[PDB]
Write a protein that binds this ligand. Structure first.
Ligand SMILES: [Cl-]
Ligand SMILES: [Cl-]
Ligand SMILES: [Cl-]
Ligand SMILES: [Cl-]
Ligand SMILES: [Cl-]
Ligand SMILES: [Cl-]
Ligand SMILES: [Cl-]
Ligand SMILES: [Cl-]
Lengths: 486, 486
């Protein structure tokens, strides 16, 4: 009944494999197709998102082969025909893949990943790519949003124990680091990704002794960097005075980094703890806070003048608790016709704004040459290049009466070649290079788009040709449905 | 900087390893300890939860060794001392593990997993166990909640593309099957767990032809079991009439299972589609619905008399969207003292109901002998056995004036031995045996606890001894904090 978990290649919806069989049997498996990945709404109503997922998807695509167990399952249980199974057994990835790079700013209603190649191959990878990219982009963006209210204070990601299974913890904490976290608690993530790892002790150490002083002394005898968790019994009356006593007794034999509070009304507690430390002469000791924190509670605490220096965030960051899915989709936007020419494809819905934008596209980030001012993104059909134009017309695709002519601009294409016909041409950067790239992209975005409260809407505009092309196909399908009925 | 991902053993918080070092260096690593896992609030305000995670945690514990890369990272990057590293290098799991079984009903404020053994070893496994069990139990419970409003209609889990990374998709869909899903879309989950797999085609097949009739015929030529997705262009005007045409032309050469609708106002659309099918003579063809469904929208659709037969649920099930974390914790409840006897441990907080219940405990499910009526769970210290008692006193631990004397009962211990001193004594059941066990446990629960709307609160009561013991330790700690201040 069950087979070895030795492969990601069947980490896919059954729809995909059934469609692949249909194409293969009818000799259409090698029709040239273009698919694009995008999301429709800004996550958390944030002003921007931070792209993550590329390293993951690169590893997946470079190892995309059907194993013996994969094929045996499809044969023995699902009863797929032998002939199709030999096609799968000889499968090797031959699609072109273009993508935003990790740490790039991305927005809704623009392509983030584009896959072009044989129809059957494009179909196979959709599910896995969405599974990876949806989550990783969501968490990087949540981390940016939290780091934005914190400013230069450290943000520590401590949510492994509450994450949605193992991959979510390790890849989520990596995304958080890209987004704006400064360290993780997760040692494996440190090992395999090179993220800085932090954390001293938990309540169990203190309970193992039955008192704060002896546990803190035990920790201080065996470690140089000391942060004491003070709320096992009583923060103000037991924990903090015990911490102070240990720090005085040990002197320069430890680094007394500070104390951690993990409960209570943090604004009032942090103020009194700050006073106890300062009165004892420990004016450089820091206060670390954890416990159900997110951007909302952190902003409030800081606006209440809490005396918190370091923020540990777990559950609400690692699960993106208030919106735990980004909603990215993959759609067919162009397909080879019987005449061997590309035909742009559309899918309708009740919503006339939720209709797919057809055609193979590029996304151009427009910046003013003078002062690098963010002008927005400009989405074109593949054949247009705004670098070759003196002037472009940017209009809101719904509210078309909102518009500007833009001159003296630079235009950067966001989708970059990663694989050309299955062959990798992009060298993977180090995680620190990704984090720096995110920082530089954010530093370059105008403040109005970057704030957590009521950010302005970053323009994502379709070119006149792309927009007219969309409306023309929409009208043609509408007319065809009419002819069919009557 | 970075090492091979060959091990789960460092999938842990750094706190754990730092505490382990402290214990080891001070010769307390082998102190006998007891930890218990529990959650504090019912997920989704549901009447019960369904336990999942045991197979996963068993696999993890049976392979818990420090690899060469694990140790090299701890040495070269974190700079742990060689002596401690040799302890880790020779580590083998020697803890006793007791647990609810997968498919067991579980509730808040009772131990679900108990680990007993050397203090340092218990500390290592906490983080990973919570990461696995939190998620898996949450999704099984969400699936039960959704299946409860569906009744005998099939529930199909289709959320892989929106899940929080890969493990979440495969282990989440397994949990959903245990909970109440009837099939998955995820082929790998089918391969490695034996879950039934389902799904026909997506919009891309239809767009590849540019019309419904030709795509449906293509699918019908190459497959026997046909469900046609009808909403690419126009459900009522194009899709459904095309489906009907294909079904008439193919006759008994296919199984026309029905049509899928993935958009629009499903209540009105399903009624008209039902009429079109029936008027054409296809009174047995089913209507499949997908698109942002959960228990709330499904109950509403069914109460509006929607003509939907099969339900596909993705995002909201696989991510537990309205509450994406269960909130399970691990706490030290007893520790060996200097005299070699066990000392029960407590941790306080601002909340006097959020104080940990000390001691090694068992959970007894109480049922009336006559009619199997659910009387609740009865949590005792380890030394009590209600099977040996004619009468037990069950009282609400806060509202103590709510109480009953229970006689003529059966009492079943929920925590079962899985590992004895690191050695497995529990044979793992098949997934179908787990699903059946959940079904039988649910069939045995009284309807008042099982309904989705305002379920009654299932009693979880502490025995008189366990409750008095808790209050006595609380008072002692309170008195000790007083003596310390003044
Ligand atoms: Cl640290
Ligand atoms: Cl810490
Ligand atoms: Cl005070
Ligand atoms: Cl999609
Ligand atoms: Cl099916
Ligand atoms: Cl289907
Ligand atoms: Cl009609
Ligand atoms: Cl915990």
């Amino acid at each position: 009944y069950t087979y070895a978990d030795d492969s990601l290649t069947l980490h896919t919806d059954m729809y995909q494999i059934n469609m692949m069989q249909t194409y293969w049997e009818l000799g259409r498996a090698d029709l040239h197709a273009v698919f694009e990945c995008y999301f429709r709404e800004m996550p958390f109503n944030h002003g921007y998102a931070i792209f993550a997922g590329l390293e993951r998807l690169v590893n997946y695509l470079e190892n995309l082969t059907f194993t013996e167990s994969d094929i045996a399952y499809l044969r023995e249980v699902e009863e797929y025909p032998e002939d199709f199974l030999t096609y799968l057994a000889n499968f090797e990835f031959k699609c072109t893949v273009r993508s935003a790079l990790e740490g790039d700013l991305v927005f809704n209603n623009e392509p983030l990943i584009q896959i072009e190649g044989p129809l059957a191959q494009c179909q196979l990878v959709e599910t896995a790519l969405l599974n990876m990219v949806n989550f990783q982009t969501l968490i990087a963006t949540k981390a940016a949003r939290i780091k934005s209210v914190i400013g230069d204070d450290p943000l520590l990601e401590f949510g492994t124990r509450r994450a949605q299974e193992l991959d979510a913890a390790i890849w989520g904490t990596r995304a958080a680091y890209i987004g704006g976290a400064d360290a993780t608690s997760n040692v494996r993530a440190g090992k395999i990704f090179g993220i800085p790892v932090s954390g001293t002790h938990a309540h169990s150490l203190v309970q193992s002794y039955g008192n704060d002083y002896e546990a803190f002394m035990a920790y201080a005898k065996t470690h140089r960097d000391c942060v004491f968790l003070v709320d096992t019994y009583d923060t103000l009356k037991a924990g903090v005075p015990s911490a102070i006593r240990v720090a005085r007794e040990m002197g320069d034999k430890i680094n007394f980094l500070g104390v951690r509070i993990d409960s209570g009304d943090m604004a009032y507690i942090s103020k009194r703890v700050r006073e106890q430390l300062d009165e004892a002469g420990f004016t450089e000791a820091k206060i670390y806070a954890s416990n159900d924190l997110d951007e909302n509670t952190i902003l409030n605490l800081k606006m209440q003048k809490s005396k918190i220096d370091v923020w540990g965030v777990g559950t609400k960051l690692i699960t993106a608790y208030d919106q735990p899915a980004l909603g990215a989709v993959f759609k067919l936007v162009s397909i080879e016709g019987e005449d061997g020419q590309m035909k742009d494809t559309i899918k309708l819905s009740s919503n006339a704004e939720k209709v797919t934008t057809p055609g193979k596209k590029q996304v151009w980030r427009i910046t003013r040459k003078s002062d690098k001012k963010s002008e927005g993104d400009y989405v074109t059909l593949w054949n247009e290049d705004p670098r070759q134009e003196e002037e472009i017309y940017m209009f809101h695709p719904v509210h078309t009466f909102i518009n500007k002519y833009v001159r003296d601009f630079e235009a950067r294409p966001v989708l970059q070649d990663i694989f050309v016909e299955g062959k990798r041409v992009y060298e993977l950067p180090t995680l620190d290079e990704i984090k720096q790239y995110a920082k530089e992209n954010l530093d370059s975005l105008h403040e109005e788009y970057k704030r957590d409260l009521n950010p302005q809407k970053y323009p994502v505009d379709l070119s006149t040709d792309c927009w007219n092309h969309k409306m023309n196909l929409l009208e043609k399908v509408r007319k065809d449905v009419k002819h069919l009925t009557e």
